[PDB]
Design a protein around this ligand. Structure first.
Ligand SMILES: COc1cc(C(=O)c2ccc(C)cc2C)cc([N+](=O)O)c1O
Ligand SMILES: COc1cc(C(=O)c2ccc(C)cc2C)cc([N+](=O)O)c1O
Lengths: 116, 116, 116, 116
């Protein structure tokens, strides 16, 4: 609910289906602690990662396993993964969508942050 | 149903709301004929542009009125509009989403084409 | 010199070489008048389109022939071209670089505008 | 020379000047070892990070300090940095250009890889 990830494929013109996504939260010692993870659905979307209670302010990293995605399609990739690192700030009610558009040698990412 | 447009704002991190979108189909004389149009909703989406019966194969242009969008936000823009020109090809059942991510001096667009 | 175009290939991670580019300028009767054209070099760059004298104020359209590029690589892409439409030199001469990043179902474009 | 970084600003339509960039290389114990760092110039480019001798095969992370860039412009952005993680030189030396296009809530990155 508070955090959704959506992944699209710029080569095939499709959702990026069955992509592994890991979310980490930065710990006090500056290490990355696993927070949530899953695989994108047939729509390219990954829902249900966290809850309002669990998602507190902090620094988060979303790692999208793009290399494995491209390899499963038989397409030669450049990156190991796509990484999105951001701060969650409580500024009234907010829902976050982290969206990524994947190509073999490029990616784009945006945040769509809305007030429900 | 067969054609949806979605527009996002990379500066504000939001859907691009109330953006005018025009769709044209290329005529035999190479001119662009108005085909459908509307304004994006609060989700950034524009549904209901056309019907399965009306949307035939051909060359289409989607013009997204980005300059007016940025001006309404008080942000100085570069482009007059964003233009997406593509061929619709009947290759089994297909639904098209034309998505765009807007910045003042840049835009990105992709097509998400799925079989319902 | 005042107008340069650069095109990159997001599948191969390379310059997009031998891409045709056509520049138009909106005429007083609202038609698109041919202005300049050329092909990208081995670096993906297209220099020498115009001159300071010829590049007057106006609304310009840069059409990048992405479909012909993909077809030459044996790929059937989604878009016919990538189009960049902008007002130029409205506050005196500027140098414009129009850059594009290509995938079969997506493109991104940015402008870099500098004052000499 | 073998590794160059270029950063552009999609709000202003300009090179992103004075952007800090830190490159790491994955060590045999799976930690990220510092490798090279620098700042983009007035053209948005960062040359001279490394040498052919030092740039061995490995997994590299290029961290572009986008938050510090935006904060210096008086903007509160979404991301902490932009991260580009890739295996380099796996089939012999290549020249890599890592390019990034920045907005407050989005970034795009591409790689241009050439064989000398
Ligand atoms: C089809 O549906 C969607 C598509 C897209 C995108 O195509 C998109 C994704 C990332 C980037 C950096 C840029 C683009 C244009 C995002 C969406 N979303 O809701 O953010 C979305 O729903
Ligand atoms: C003006 O000069 C350059 C521009 C650009 C880009 O505009 C570009 C950058 C990132 C992305 C994701 C997409 C785009 C189109 C890249 C360059 N390069 O060498 O990669 C370059 O030289």
């Amino acid at each position: 609910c508070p955090l959704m990830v959506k992944v699209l494929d710029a080569v095939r013109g499709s959702p990026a289906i069955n992509v592994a996504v890991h979310v980490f939260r930065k710990a006090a010692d500056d290490t990355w602690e696993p927070f949530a993870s899953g695989k994108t659905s047939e729509s390219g979307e990954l829902h249900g990662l966290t809850t309002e209670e669990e998602f507190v302010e902090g620094i988060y990293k979303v790692e999208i396993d793009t290399k494995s995605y491209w390899k499963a399609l038989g397409i030669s990739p450049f990156h190991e993964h796509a990484e999105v690192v951001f701060t969650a700030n409580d500024s009234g009610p907010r829902r976050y969508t982290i969206a990524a558009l994947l190509s073999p040698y490029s990616y784009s990412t945006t945040a769509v942050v809305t007030n429900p």
